[PDB]
Design an enzyme around this catalytic site. Sequence first.
Site, PDB file in Angstrom:
ATOM      1  N   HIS A  77      43.466  34.949  52.538  1.00  0.00           N
ATOM      2  CA  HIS A  77      44.557  35.856  52.873  1.00  0.00           C
ATOM      3  C   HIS A  77      45.649  35.170  53.695  1.00  0.00           C
ATOM      4  CE1 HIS A  77      42.002  39.413  51.575  1.00  0.00           C
ATOM      5  NE2 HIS A  77      43.161  39.598  50.968  1.00  0.00           N
ATOM      6  N   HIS A  81      48.410  32.599  49.283  1.00  0.00           N
ATOM      7  CA  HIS A  81      48.204  33.882  48.614  1.00  0.00           C
ATOM      8  C   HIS A  81      49.476  34.755  48.570  1.00  0.00           C
ATOM      9  CE1 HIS A  81      46.657  37.716  47.303  1.00  0.00           C
ATOM     10  NE2 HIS A  81      46.939  38.254  48.476  1.00  0.00           N
ATOM     11  N   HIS A 117      53.193  41.426  52.321  1.00  0.00           N
ATOM     12  CA  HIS A 117      52.108  42.393  52.139  1.00  0.00           C
ATOM     13  C   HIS A 117      50.815  42.024  52.850  1.00  0.00           C
ATOM     14  CE1 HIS A 117      50.179  39.756  49.181  1.00  0.00           C
ATOM     15  NE2 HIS A 117      49.146  40.573  49.232  1.00  0.00           N
ATOM     16  N   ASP A 118      50.660  40.759  53.209  1.00  0.00           N
ATOM     17  CA  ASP A 118      49.454  40.344  53.928  1.00  0.00           C
ATOM     18  C   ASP A 118      49.703  39.634  55.249  1.00  0.00           C
ATOM     19  OD1 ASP A 118      47.176  41.316  52.749  1.00  0.00           O
ATOM     20  OD2 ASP A 118      47.164  39.846  51.142  1.00  0.00           O
ATOM     21  N   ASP A 235      48.471  41.299  42.982  1.00  0.00           N
ATOM     22  CA  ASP A 235      47.478  41.106  44.039  1.00  0.00           C
ATOM     23  C   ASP A 235      46.054  40.901  43.499  1.00  0.00           C
ATOM     24  OD1 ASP A 235      47.311  40.799  46.805  1.00  0.00           O
ATOM     25  OD2 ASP A 235      46.463  42.808  47.075  1.00  0.00           O
ATOM     26  N   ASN A 238      44.438  36.923  40.120  1.00  0.00           N
ATOM     27  CA  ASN A 238      43.673  35.679  40.114  1.00  0.00           C
ATOM     28  C   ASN A 238      42.767  35.511  38.879  1.00  0.00           C
ATOM     29  OD1 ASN A 238      43.769  37.321  42.766  1.00  0.00           O
ATOM     30  ND2 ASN A 238      44.056  35.200  43.514  1.00  0.00           N
ATOM     31  N   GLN A 286      31.826  38.321  40.552  1.00  0.00           N
ATOM     32  CA  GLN A 286      33.082  38.173  39.833  1.00  0.00           C
ATOM     33  C   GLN A 286      33.098  38.925  38.509  1.00  0.00           C
ATOM     34  OE1 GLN A 286      36.107  37.202  40.603  1.00  0.00           O
ATOM     35  NE2 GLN A 286      35.421  36.811  42.699  1.00  0.00           N
ATOM     36  N   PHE A 289      33.173  42.701  39.280  1.00  0.00           N
ATOM     37  CA  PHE A 289      34.503  42.956  39.809  1.00  0.00           C
ATOM     38  C   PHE A 289      35.562  42.996  38.706  1.00  0.00           C
ATOM     39  CE2 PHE A 289      38.429  41.766  42.102  1.00  0.00           C
ATOM     40  CZ  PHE A 289      38.459  42.817  42.997  1.00  0.00           C
TER      41      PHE A 289
HETATM   42  C1  LIG Z   1      35.160  47.908  45.073  1.00  0.00           C
HETATM   43  C2  LIG Z   1      36.586  47.892  45.567  1.00  0.00           C
HETATM   44  N1  LIG Z   1      36.976  46.667  46.272  1.00  0.00           N
HETATM   45  C3  LIG Z   1      36.028  45.807  46.965  1.00  0.00           C
HETATM   46  O1  LIG Z   1      34.834  45.893  46.696  1.00  0.00           O
HETATM   47  N2  LIG Z   1      36.433  44.758  47.908  1.00  0.00           N
HETATM   48  C4  LIG Z   1      35.452  43.726  48.124  1.00  0.00           C
HETATM   49  C5  LIG Z   1      35.423  42.810  46.928  1.00  0.00           C
HETATM   50  C6  LIG Z   1      36.828  42.355  46.629  1.00  0.00           C
HETATM   51  C7  LIG Z   1      37.904  43.063  47.189  1.00  0.00           C
HETATM   52  S1  LIG Z   1      39.464  42.398  46.782  1.00  0.00           S
HETATM   53  C8  LIG Z   1      38.796  41.114  45.821  1.00  0.00           C
HETATM   54  N3  LIG Z   1      39.525  40.105  45.113  1.00  0.00           N
HETATM   55  C9  LIG Z   1      40.953  39.923  45.211  1.00  0.00           C
HETATM   56  O2  LIG Z   1      41.654  40.744  45.782  1.00  0.00           O
HETATM   57  C10 LIG Z   1      41.601  38.873  44.353  1.00  0.00           C
HETATM   58  C11 LIG Z   1      40.558  38.140  43.562  1.00  0.00           C
HETATM   59  C12 LIG Z   1      39.914  38.673  42.427  1.00  0.00           C
HETATM   60  C13 LIG Z   1      38.984  37.779  41.865  1.00  0.00           C
HETATM   61  C14 LIG Z   1      38.910  36.545  42.561  1.00  0.00           C
HETATM   62  S2  LIG Z   1      39.982  36.518  43.895  1.00  0.00           S
HETATM   63  C15 LIG Z   1      37.336  41.171  45.801  1.00  0.00           C
HETATM   64  C16 LIG Z   1      36.415  40.205  45.095  1.00  0.00           C
HETATM   65  O3  LIG Z   1      36.877  39.406  44.229  1.00  0.00           O
HETATM   66  O4  LIG Z   1      35.281  39.993  45.647  1.00  0.00           O
HETATM   67  C17 LIG Z   1      34.121  39.525  44.997  1.00  0.00           C
HETATM   68  C18 LIG Z   1      33.619  40.363  43.883  1.00  0.00           C
HETATM   69  C19 LIG Z   1      32.652  41.324  44.519  1.00  0.00           C
HETATM   70  C20 LIG Z   1      32.261  40.710  45.837  1.00  0.00           C
HETATM   71  C21 LIG Z   1      32.944  39.372  45.899  1.00  0.00           C
HETATM   72  C22 LIG Z   1      37.785  44.304  48.003  1.00  0.00           C
HETATM   73 ZN   LIG Z   2      46.874  40.465  49.057  1.00  0.00          ZN
HETATM   74 ZN   LIG Z   3      46.089  43.117  51.480  1.00  0.00          ZN
END
Ligand SMILES: CCNC(=O)N1CCc2c(sc(NC(=O)Cc3cccs3)c2C(=O)OC2CCCC2)C1
Ligand SMILES: [Zn+2]
Ligand SMILES: [Zn+2]
Length: 327
Positions: A77, A81, A117-118, A235, A238, A286, A289
């Site tokens: 962050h 970014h 934003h961050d 945002d 990625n 990943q 997500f």
């Molecule tokens: C459920 C709503 N939101 C959340 O849970 N949380 C925790 C998990 C998570 C966020 S925001 C984000 N990733 C990013 O903003 C940008 C990226 C996307 C992919 C690579 S960098 C992840 C995330 O990529 O975390 C990983 C996947 C799960 C745990 C680790 C908020």
């Molecule tokens: Zn951001």
């Molecule tokens: Zn943010």
Amino acid sequence: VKTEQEDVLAKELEDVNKWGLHVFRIAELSGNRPLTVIMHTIFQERDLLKTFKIPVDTLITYLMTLEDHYHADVAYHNNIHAADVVQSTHVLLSTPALEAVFTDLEILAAIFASAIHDVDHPGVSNQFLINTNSELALMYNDSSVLENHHLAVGFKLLQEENCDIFQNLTKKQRQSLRKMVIDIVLATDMSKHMNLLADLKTMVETKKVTSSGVLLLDNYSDRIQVLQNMVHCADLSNPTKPLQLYRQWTDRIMEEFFRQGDRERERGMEISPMCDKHNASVEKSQVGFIDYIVHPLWETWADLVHPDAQDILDTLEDNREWYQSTI
Ligand SMILES: CCNC(=O)N1CCc2c(sc(NC(=O)Cc3cccs3)c2C(=O)OC2CCCC2)C1
Ligand SMILES: [Zn+2]
Ligand SMILES: [Zn+2]
């Protein structure tokens, strides 16, 4: 005539209008100034200085000041970014389906919101700031803590010496700019995700088009919610970037999350979900997500701007299968 390093930086910046800019290389070349240089390039590229009568040194001063308030010791962050999301928003703004849709002011707001934003992100989550009884949490009554702070900081910095890049806008322009910037940044809070996507899907269903395939948005509600989803997309862009970039981002966010996990354990706070360095499937997290958040969102966006996002959507699906293998 530039130094050789500047020339190399400059040849990299020729990719500004393209998904996959090697932002990390720009960060290196620019002496850790990716946000400043990318913003400056976009503003000149979009003629924003003339249009809004922004003195260039005022722009540089603010940009540098803004970037300095991102944390270098924050793995994800950070200013890199910020730069990434600025340029990504920049690309999304140029999509053929949205040509001639947004006013210069709205563009200015989407880019400026991306830049701030961050800012001053401490590398820990809202829940962490709330559970530690932090000052920030108490200032914002536990609601959108980080996001409120990003806004307050990004605006406040305009008051530093020679930093007011909006000094020449009329009161009308500034009030409108500011509201848009506030609505955009508050929507970056992930807790707003499902609702944002609900509105986006609803707009895809009711989508309208006029004169040469360009989208139609005839009320603030629709126009702001599009810009909100656009920046939210940037945002969460990625996993849609070339795998080389995506993999670096994943390392960084996981480094940040594990650092927070460590800090949580150092005090016996319950170790956040998938923040545990010892028991975590990075690859599996990943994929989930992407399946649950990134793909539904990007697929919906792709429908709004069809077929403009097709390649971005392909890339995301490719990177999804890749991570799947990895498991
Ligand atoms: C459920 C709503 N939101 C959340 O849970 N949380 C925790 C998990 C998570 C966020 S925001 C984000 N990733 C990013 O903003 C940008 C990226 C996307 C992919 C690579 S960098 C992840 C995330 O990529 O975390 C990983 C996947 C799960 C745990 C680790 C908020
Ligand atoms: Zn951001
Ligand atoms: Zn943010």
